[PDB]
Design an enzyme around this catalytic site. Structure first.
Site, PDB file in Angstrom:
ATOM      1  N   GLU A 259     -37.046  18.080 -27.131  1.00  0.00           N
ATOM      2  CA  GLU A 259     -38.044  19.040 -27.654  1.00  0.00           C
ATOM      3  C   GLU A 259     -38.183  18.832 -29.161  1.00  0.00           C
ATOM      4  OE1 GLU A 259     -36.434  22.759 -26.504  1.00  0.00           O
ATOM      5  OE2 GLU A 259     -34.551  22.485 -27.597  1.00  0.00           O
TER       6      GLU A 259
ATOM      7  N   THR B 204     -30.573  18.368 -21.225  1.00  0.00           N
ATOM      8  CA  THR B 204     -30.685  17.108 -21.994  1.00  0.00           C
ATOM      9  C   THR B 204     -29.317  16.693 -22.544  1.00  0.00           C
ATOM     10  OG1 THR B 204     -31.860  15.958 -23.749  1.00  0.00           O
ATOM     11  CG2 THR B 204     -31.368  18.267 -24.136  1.00  0.00           C
TER      12      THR B 204
ATOM     13  N   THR C 247     -24.942  31.791 -20.784  1.00  0.00           N
ATOM     14  CA  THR C 247     -26.323  31.778 -21.318  1.00  0.00           C
ATOM     15  C   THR C 247     -27.348  31.383 -20.246  1.00  0.00           C
ATOM     16  OG1 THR C 247     -25.548  31.305 -23.551  1.00  0.00           O
ATOM     17  CG2 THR C 247     -27.795  30.636 -23.025  1.00  0.00           C
TER      18      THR C 247
ATOM     19  N   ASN D 272     -17.287  29.114 -27.054  1.00  0.00           N
ATOM     20  CA  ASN D 272     -17.860  30.077 -28.014  1.00  0.00           C
ATOM     21  C   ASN D 272     -17.126  31.419 -27.998  1.00  0.00           C
ATOM     22  OD1 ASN D 272     -19.707  28.158 -28.700  1.00  0.00           O
ATOM     23  ND2 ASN D 272     -21.358  29.015 -27.453  1.00  0.00           N
TER      24      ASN D 272
ATOM     25  N   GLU E  95      -4.719   5.350 -34.291  1.00  0.00           N
ATOM     26  CA  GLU E  95      -3.401   5.991 -34.117  1.00  0.00           C
ATOM     27  C   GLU E  95      -3.541   7.277 -33.301  1.00  0.00           C
ATOM     28  OE1 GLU E  95      -0.771   6.031 -37.364  1.00  0.00           O
ATOM     29  OE2 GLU E  95      -1.884   4.544 -38.543  1.00  0.00           O
TER      30      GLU E  95
HETATM   31  N1  LIG Z   1     -21.862  26.635 -31.266  1.00  0.00           N
HETATM   32  C1  LIG Z   1     -23.132  26.652 -30.833  1.00  0.00           C
HETATM   33  N2  LIG Z   1     -23.382  26.720 -29.509  1.00  0.00           N
HETATM   34  C2  LIG Z   1     -24.683  26.731 -29.127  1.00  0.00           C
HETATM   35  C3  LIG Z   1     -25.722  26.676 -30.001  1.00  0.00           C
HETATM   36  N3  LIG Z   1     -26.919  26.713 -29.322  1.00  0.00           N
HETATM   37  C4  LIG Z   1     -26.601  26.762 -28.041  1.00  0.00           C
HETATM   38  N4  LIG Z   1     -25.238  26.796 -27.857  1.00  0.00           N
HETATM   39  C5  LIG Z   1     -24.532  26.876 -26.576  1.00  0.00           C
HETATM   40  O1  LIG Z   1     -24.746  25.725 -25.783  1.00  0.00           O
HETATM   41  C6  LIG Z   1     -25.113  26.109 -24.440  1.00  0.00           C
HETATM   42  C7  LIG Z   1     -26.579  25.870 -24.277  1.00  0.00           C
HETATM   43  O2  LIG Z   1     -26.758  24.476 -24.461  1.00  0.00           O
HETATM   44  P1  LIG Z   1     -28.071  23.906 -25.184  1.00  0.00           P
HETATM   45  O3  LIG Z   1     -27.664  23.137 -26.397  1.00  0.00           O
HETATM   46  O4  LIG Z   1     -29.047  25.004 -25.462  1.00  0.00           O
HETATM   47  O5  LIG Z   1     -28.699  22.867 -24.140  1.00  0.00           O
HETATM   48  P2  LIG Z   1     -29.691  21.764 -24.738  1.00  0.00           P
HETATM   49  O6  LIG Z   1     -28.862  20.706 -25.375  1.00  0.00           O
HETATM   50  O7  LIG Z   1     -30.666  22.433 -25.663  1.00  0.00           O
HETATM   51  O8  LIG Z   1     -30.421  21.204 -23.424  1.00  0.00           O
HETATM   52  P3  LIG Z   1     -31.944  21.623 -23.097  1.00  0.00           P
HETATM   53  O9  LIG Z   1     -31.924  23.087 -22.777  1.00  0.00           O
HETATM   54  O10 LIG Z   1     -32.429  20.827 -21.926  1.00  0.00           O
HETATM   55  O11 LIG Z   1     -32.774  21.352 -24.327  1.00  0.00           O
HETATM   56  C8  LIG Z   1     -24.727  27.572 -24.318  1.00  0.00           C
HETATM   57  O12 LIG Z   1     -23.364  27.688 -23.958  1.00  0.00           O
HETATM   58  C9  LIG Z   1     -24.954  28.073 -25.735  1.00  0.00           C
HETATM   59  O13 LIG Z   1     -24.101  29.162 -25.987  1.00  0.00           O
HETATM   60  C10 LIG Z   1     -25.470  26.602 -31.381  1.00  0.00           C
HETATM   61  O14 LIG Z   1     -26.349  26.554 -32.221  1.00  0.00           O
HETATM   62  N5  LIG Z   1     -24.130  26.594 -31.766  1.00  0.00           N
HETATM   63 MG   LIG Z   2     -33.501  22.648 -25.762  1.00  0.00          MG
END
Ligand SMILES: Nc1nc2c(ncn2[C@@H]2O[C@H](COP(=O)(O)OP(=O)(O)OP(=O)(O)O)[C@@H](O)[C@H]2O)c(=O)[nH]1
Ligand SMILES: [Mg+2]
Ligand SMILES: Nc1nc2c(ncn2[C@@H]2O[C@H](COP(=O)(O)OP(=O)(O)OP(=O)(O)O)[C@@H](O)[C@H]2O)c(=O)[nH]1
Ligand SMILES: Nc1nc2c(ncn2[C@@H]2O[C@H](COP(=O)(O)OP(=O)(O)O)[C@@H](O)[C@H]2O)c(=O)[nH]1
Ligand SMILES: Nc1nc2c(ncn2[C@@H]2O[C@H](COP(=O)(O)OP(=O)(O)O)[C@@H](O)[C@H]2O)c(=O)[nH]1
Ligand SMILES: [Mg+2]
EC number: 3.6.5.-
Lengths: 442, 52, 430, 442, 430
Positions: free
Chosen positions: D70, D144, D178, D205, D253
């Site tokens: 995206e 993704t 989520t 998290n 290491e």
């Molecule tokens: N630490 C942290 N976790 C995040 C963040 N954004 C999303 N997450 C976590 O990652 C998971 C969601 O994964 P995403 O990264 O949204 O998935 P994606 O990589 O965007 O994949 P797509 O939805 O297909 O675009 C959930 O457990 C969220 O809590 C962030 O900015 N920081």
């Molecule tokens: Mg996304």
């Protein structure tokens, strides 16, 4: 130390406009043929002589002829800004075009104009003392470029003989197309170019469109962009005659090193640092990165993939701040790569050239300013795929004589189509036999 | 009918704010979003020197 | 590279008056004949259509012919009529009577020699002559007979030049005359032998353009003749202005006609749009291409969707990129591949010209060679067969002197033209 | 010396923003890629080289690519404050997301975008002379991140071979969630991640939220806080390559000391002096206190209790003013404790590192300034409990083919679910077998 | 990622008019079409709903279709009506007569080609096409018949995109038309095969929202259409603004529908509260969650207390912590566990967006998949069975041409949809 340029038809004259704009701006000649007072002080130089001759009053005039059957493009040169640069006799124009008919240019109409062209070239060649070749610009897709280019090259080849003739030719791209009769004209042109040319450089507009979209960020290019890139390539090849350098390359050495057998003279061309100002300031541009760039198919100006064939010879021209040891290290690294293959009968596959003058920047241009550049012309068996596709399109149309009545009406025998098609078929078989992986000892 | 030259100039003035005209002009590289300085010798690293 | 125009009959003379208004406007010629233009580009090719008379005036290289002077007196009396050379108006003293045989055999042979004398006087003065351009209707009486007679004489005298015709042909939906099928059949027989390229327009298509596309509340014949004059002035634009990819009438003929009998074409002009809508949509090459292939924008009743394109040509006027033009023509050819003849690898030729028509940023004119034109000729042949079996009005034509054998010959030749188009539509590569 | 960073999807790019903010501020690179202070001769430094390369004009640019399907997150990077730091080719964006489908990312959409990523990684790896690994940041809960992360790790593993690949991965928290389809994506991710990663660090998290509420005084935390903590951890692990120290630790290491058997490579991570500015000036923070702190479960960034397992290896990173004798006294005191247990086949359970550069303080940050810090990564059998709860949620959902029709429509059949579930069951049995005490010495 | 909208019938055109007012307000576009916004964040995604017209102007991507022009003349006379492209208004010359068969078979087949032509011209202009959005009522005549016909044609032509419909179902207490059950049953039969996701709204639930929550003394259709426009403009917000946890229509579909027939959803919007009370209580995520799950705030007659949630989605707009969202969704699932499906381990999806609607500090839109939906279909099926057994008004539809087997098929298919919801409500592990 001298070269004469012949421009034919629309593509050749428009590419010529970009070339002469560049050669003037690189030497410092004004559009009115003069040269400012500060370029001619303290030292006395002759480098312009390759492309310009000076009169006794110090005006410069260029060593070129412009040939067309329609007046419009030459009338644009006659009424434009460079009106005073060219000698008016050099700009020759007929009354009517060859109408996409090879027969009209070769048999009916070019036969009237050809003797004036030969008289101008003779008057130019007699006022020389080190002529070292002819440069010819034309497109093989159109009628006057094919027919008059062939007829004029035949006459030049009988009159001047052994002197070399290097052609830059725009062939029909594999899927973008502009006219229906392109296959017939390209086959009939190629039949004449086999006998009467020493090296032929192949260009496709679809590759330059892809290069301008991918490297530069231009979504909607026009012919001035493509013509400026072609002009840069021609300036790179001819720089070896005009400026000081570590390893010079005379125009006869290209022909000696690149052609293994007398029919195998069609070469691919590519140029490395085509880059925009925003990318240019994010990256260093050392010798090894541009050497790696010239071998990627994203850098080529012809739509062919060199991974489907084997290289026979490569000639690499470096211009600008480069030192020979990095060129040697780069060529050894390229030689190490597994996706680059040379025929086993060509062990020493490379020719190098190194010149100190960096590439010039044009005020309205789109290329960035860079300290070094490399340009490559190479001979590879992959070019056989372009001819096979032209032959398929010819076979599709010729099986039903789709448009032949125009050619027969303008003076051509139907037999000439079959002769040319058999000669190009023999060229395809030559590229199959020369590329043989191995021969048996028994 | 064309309303002369001032209307045409203002019409072209109101056009370039479009995103298409910004990122897709005719026969040009799209403009930069920050200033860049071209060095005297050009872009790229200078070749390193060594003692004679 | 100059063209000589001939206007014959009421329809031809009326379309010609509007054509010369459009051409005089584009080159800035005052109706008094004085040059009042505002760019040197206008003067530098003025020779193509105008000859220069003493002082400031320019005179148009046209011959006006008609059998009753009513129309000619109307055109001479019009607002731009004075520009025409007085010696170029040729007229008789009695009408064609809507009869083909009268127009071709009795009064035709009486006047024709003076028209050839004027056309030869105009042609031999030219330094290099390009093709002739003729406007006439095929359904009329004087238009059909003397237009085809004069075309035959000019084809005998100038066989190496180009022969171009613009022709209006009868529709069954709104006929103005009962004996249209006879005149049409004899005229198509003459044109298919004599012409190099013939363009056909239906009045029904111009009414549908005006009502649906332009939403005119009350269109008039001046509007239909203005649309035709627009396309006629557009096809010749590359002869008289600079451009990135020049084109010529001979280049159009060599790229469009695969076999000598297949020279009948459809016309269209793209930037047609109503004054209310113009504020809502900008011009661009994709938009022009979409209108250009829309059957709504074509000036014949037959629709492309029932046939296949052998060849087509598009001439673009304006400042635009060649990459977008090439890929648009490729995308249209690839996505609708079933409607393009498969044994030709590329069916569309493009051309680009720098100077657009006044008041438009860009414009394109489209010429198409499509097999669906056979339905129009077939409809005319049906009405002829219905009328001929009963000798419905034949005594007028026989009284002028024609043998019935001409009617069977003309029907056989038109039927063979329809057969030749139908065979290539329904065929395989094998 | 060099390391390349690959950021995939939303979590990986947003954590990347915090990482590059920290690495810039630690080296002193301005947001526009410059360098304050003097540049003349007399002093000379190289620590940036691990993460940045300089152009001939002296601008710095970082060794990273940002990958997303995206556009929104990369367009936020393009229009943000660090616009001038990144090269525009590095920020790659597709047209549409993988819509929480691993199948859509792997089969339908990632197959078109993957070749640009490999071309960028190739251009980076060619500008190196001592590359020692790839760092990858992604979440396995999304479409993704799972699909394209797996496909890219497979292609990277074939092309580059022996080079190490270290992943920082966010697993779905045991009760915070989520999206509904997280278990399927996590199982399918783990199947690919098992074969193609050398060490994987696990984060949840829910643990970072608990740590930020209890230790820091933040009542209403958001993702920027978690991303700054992750950036501190990665900076602590990579500090050993960039600055002087008493006991250095090279990335090879880590793999030699932490992984006993080739499948047992999943590690827990924790950080000790997470403290607020108001508490920091009321207390001393000696080595023995922070060494005792890293073993308390309140310090961990993964929701697991180590009292339910056995440690196999621990790697302790000390940075700042620490003396080796204090580290030895601390490790001996930890070894004395009765609630900390090591497997009997691992007698020398600890590896130590000591670096002189103290942790950096970020202007808008919430951590206090401290003279010393310690970071730990450890391998323990307790991690088997984390996989079991995901597998239980998978078994409940998979019993009715609850959402499978989306995955089967986009190309993944049905057997692959059972295959992945059996592979994770075998990984659970591996953690059961390695932790079983030896029955006898004979 | 751009959506194309189609508005059909009176209800659809009026709700669409209010929707385009709300969206034009959120991006700061004047009713003349000029951009007048106050942050770059508004302009950077304007392409999602608008196409660009000449000199600054923007045009909204919508097609208007109706069988009698009265509504079209009313919307054109409205305050934002000028923004719409004139060529996009399609109307006939005789009404639907409240008859589904007339709207589907007689005037439908007459106009349908022109609506697909407009949708294709607009669709092929997009650089990458996201799903379509359609507004119509199921109880009417042209809305139900032509809406389902058009849905079928767009699903044949674009099977890889998303298909979205918003539909106002007939109410159980006050009908405006006697033959509502037939039109509703046939329309639900068409939607369950063709649609990907369909949202259903009663008129009785919106009246109860107006009377109890907003305490309006005399509500009017403008208020009803404003309530619908708020949720419709809210579902797409993550497509066009930045945020901490992005979401998409395809991502919503993947997370909400367990099995392909169960794609009918309820809608709600939370911060509805009267102007007198607003000064005494600030907005916060616990307050939003409490209003969001209150059945008083749901716009479908069926009440959640009679069913169980399979899945739900909440999209939050505003600056807020993700911890509060996660912990609120966990606490609501744990405390009300009997109303949440026990096999799915977590039923709520969350999303967070930075830009709130103008004038509110925070807002959330709620989408729910609940098994109480069976009640609405059951009421209609019952009314259909009472009417069909006695052939109460069938001769009108049979005179238009419908076969009775279509009525028996549609009844069987709707009864099977009710059975499938009832079966999943009572499922067990065993
Ligand atoms: N630490 C942290 N976790 C995040 C963040 N954004 C999303 N997450 C976590 O990652 C998971 C969601 O994964 P995403 O990264 O949204 O998935 P994606 O990589 O965007 O994949 P797509 O939805 O297909 O675009 C959930 O457990 C969220 O809590 C962030 O900015 N920081
Ligand atoms: Mg996304
Ligand atoms: N790069 C480039 N290609 C051109 C240019 N002009 C024409 N071409 C290409 O060359 C082919 C047309 O050949 P032309 O030069 O027009 O043919 P011609 O020499 O004019 O022959 P006639 O038509 O008989 O006058 C097409 O493929 C064009 O795309 C140009 O200025 N630059
Ligand atoms: N488009 C157009 N058609 C015309 C015009 N004048 C006449 N016609 C048509 O031409 C036909 C009559 O032919 P006409 O010119 O009178 O034949 P003539 O008697 O031989 O000159 C009818 O179909 C008329 O509708 C005109 O100015 N424009
Ligand atoms: N919410 C809402 N419902 C409406 C509106 N106008 C009509 N309706 C309802 O829609 C039904 C009538 O359908 P109608 O739109 O007339 O069908 P059509 O004749 O096919 O357009 C009745 O239940 C009306 O109460 C409106 O503006 N808003
Ligand atoms: Mg030409």
């Amino acid at each position: 130390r001298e070269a004469i340029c012949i421009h034919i038809g629309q593509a050749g004259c428009q590419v010529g406009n970009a070339c002469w704009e560049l050669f003037c701006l690189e030497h410092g000649i004004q559009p009115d043929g003069a040269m400012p007072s500060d370029k001619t002080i303290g030292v006395e130089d002759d480098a312009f002589n390759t492309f310009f001759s000076e009169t006794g009053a110090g005006k410069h005039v260029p060593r070129a002829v412009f040939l067309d059957l329609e007046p419009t493009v030459v009338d644009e040169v006659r009424t434009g800004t460079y009106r005073q640069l060219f000698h008016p006799e050099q700009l020759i124009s007929g009354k009517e075009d060859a109408a996409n008919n090879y027969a009209r240019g070769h048999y009916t109409i070019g036969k009237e104009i050809v003797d004036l062209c030969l008289d101008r070239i003779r008057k130019l060649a007699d006022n020389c003392t080190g002529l070292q070749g002819f440069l010819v610009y034309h497109a093989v897709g159109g009628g006057t470029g094919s027919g008059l280019g062939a007829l004029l090259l035949e006459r030049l080849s009988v009159d001047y003989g052994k002197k070399s003739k290097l052609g830059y030719t725009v062939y029909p791209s594999p899927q973008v197309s502009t006219a229906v009769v392109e296959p017939y004209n390209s086959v009939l042109s190629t039949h004449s170019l086999l006998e009467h040319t020493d090296v032929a450089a192949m260009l496709d507009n679809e590759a330059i469109y892809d290069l301008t979209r991918r490297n530069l960020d231009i979504e909607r290019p026009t012919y001035t962009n493509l013509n400026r890139l072609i002009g840069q390539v021609v300036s790179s090849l001819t720089a070896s005659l005009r400026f000081d350098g570590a390893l010079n390359v005379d125009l006869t050495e290209f022909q000696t090193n690149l052609v293994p057998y007398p029919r195998i003279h069609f070469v691919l061309t590519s140029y490395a640092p085509v880059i925009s100002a925003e990318k240019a300031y994010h990256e260093q541009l050392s010798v090894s990165e541009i050497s790696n760039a010239v071998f990627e198919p994203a850098s080529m100006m012809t739509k062919c993939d060199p991974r489907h064939g084997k290289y026979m010879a490569c000639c690499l021209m470096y211009r600008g701040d480069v030192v020979p040891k990095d060129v040697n290290a780069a060529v050894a690294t390229i030689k190490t790569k597994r996706t680059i293959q040379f025929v086993d009968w060509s062990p020493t596959g490379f020719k190098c050239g190194i010149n100190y003058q960096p590439p010039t920047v044009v005020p309205g241009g789109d290329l960035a300013k860079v300290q070094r550049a490399v340009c490559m012309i190479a001979n590879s068996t992959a070019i056989a795929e372009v001819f096979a596709r032209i032959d398929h399109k010819f076979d599709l149309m010729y099986s039903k004589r789709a448009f032949v009545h125009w050619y027969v009406g303008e003076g051509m025998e139907e037999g000439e189509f079959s002769e040319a098609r058999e000669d190009l078929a023999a060229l395809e078989k030559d590229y199959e036999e020369v590329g043989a992986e191995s021969a048996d000892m028994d | 009918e064309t309303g002369g030259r001032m209307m045409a100039l203002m019409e072209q003035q109101l056009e370039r704010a479009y995103l298409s005209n910004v990122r897709r002009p005719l026969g040009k590289v799209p403009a930069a979003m920050y200033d860049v300085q071209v060095p005297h010798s050009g872009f790229g690293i200078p070749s390193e020197k060594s003692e004679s | 590279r100059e063209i000589v125009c001939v206007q014959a009959g009421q329809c031809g003379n009326q379309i010609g008056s509007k054509f010369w208004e459009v051409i005089s406007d584009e080159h800035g010629v005052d109706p008094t004949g004085t040059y009042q233009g505002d760019s040197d580009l206008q003067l530098e090719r003025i020779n193509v259509y105008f000859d220069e008379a003493t002082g400031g005036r320019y005179v148009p290289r046209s011959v006006l012919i008609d059998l009753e002077p009513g129309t000619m007196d109307s055109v001479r009396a019009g607002p731009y009529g004075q520009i025409f050379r007085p010696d170029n108006f040729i007229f008789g003293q009695s009408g064609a009577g809507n009869n083909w045989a009268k127009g071709h055999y009795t009064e035709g042979a009486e006047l024709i020699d003076s028209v050839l004398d004027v056309c030869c006087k105009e042609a031999e003065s030219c330094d290099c002559l390009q093709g002739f351009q003729i406007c006439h209707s095929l359904g009329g009486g004087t238009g059909s007979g003397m237009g085809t007679l004069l075309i035959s004489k000019l084809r005998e005298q100038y066989p190496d030049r180009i022969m171009m015709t613009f022709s209006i042909i009868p529709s069954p939906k709104v006929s103005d005359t009962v004996v249209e099928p006879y005149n049409t059949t004899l005229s198509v027989h003459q044109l298919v032998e004599n012409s190099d390229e013939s363009m056909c327009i239906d009045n029904e298509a111009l009414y549908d353009i005006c009502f649906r596309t332009l939403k005119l509340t009350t269109p008039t014949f001046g509007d239909l003749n203005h649309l035709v004059s627009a396309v006629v002035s557009g096809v010749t634009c590359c002869l008289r202005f600079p451009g990135q990819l020049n084109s010529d009438l001979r280049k159009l003929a060599v790229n469009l006609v695969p076999f000598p009998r297949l020279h009948f074409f459809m016309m269209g002009f793209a930037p047609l749009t109503s004054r209310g809508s113009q504020q809502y949509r900008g011009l661009s090459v994709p938009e022009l291409t979409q209108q250009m292939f829309d059957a709504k924008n074509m000036m014949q009743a037959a629709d492309p969707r029932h046939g296949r394109y052998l060849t087509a040509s598009a001439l673009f006027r304006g400042r635009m990129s060649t990459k977008e033009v090439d890929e648009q023509m490729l995308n249209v050819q690839n996505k609708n591949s079933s409607y393009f003849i498969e044994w030709i690898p590329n069916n569309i030729k493009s051309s680009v010209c720098d100077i657009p028509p006044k008041g438009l940023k860009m414009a394109v004119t489209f010429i198409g060679n499509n097999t669906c034109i056979q339905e129009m000729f077939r409809r005319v042949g049906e009405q002829f067969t219905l009328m001929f079996r009963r000798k419905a009005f034949l005594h007028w034509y026989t009284g002028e002197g024609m043998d019935e054998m001409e009617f069977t010959e003309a029907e056989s030749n038109m039927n063979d033209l329809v057969s030749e188009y139908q065979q290539y539509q329904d065929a395989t590569i094998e």
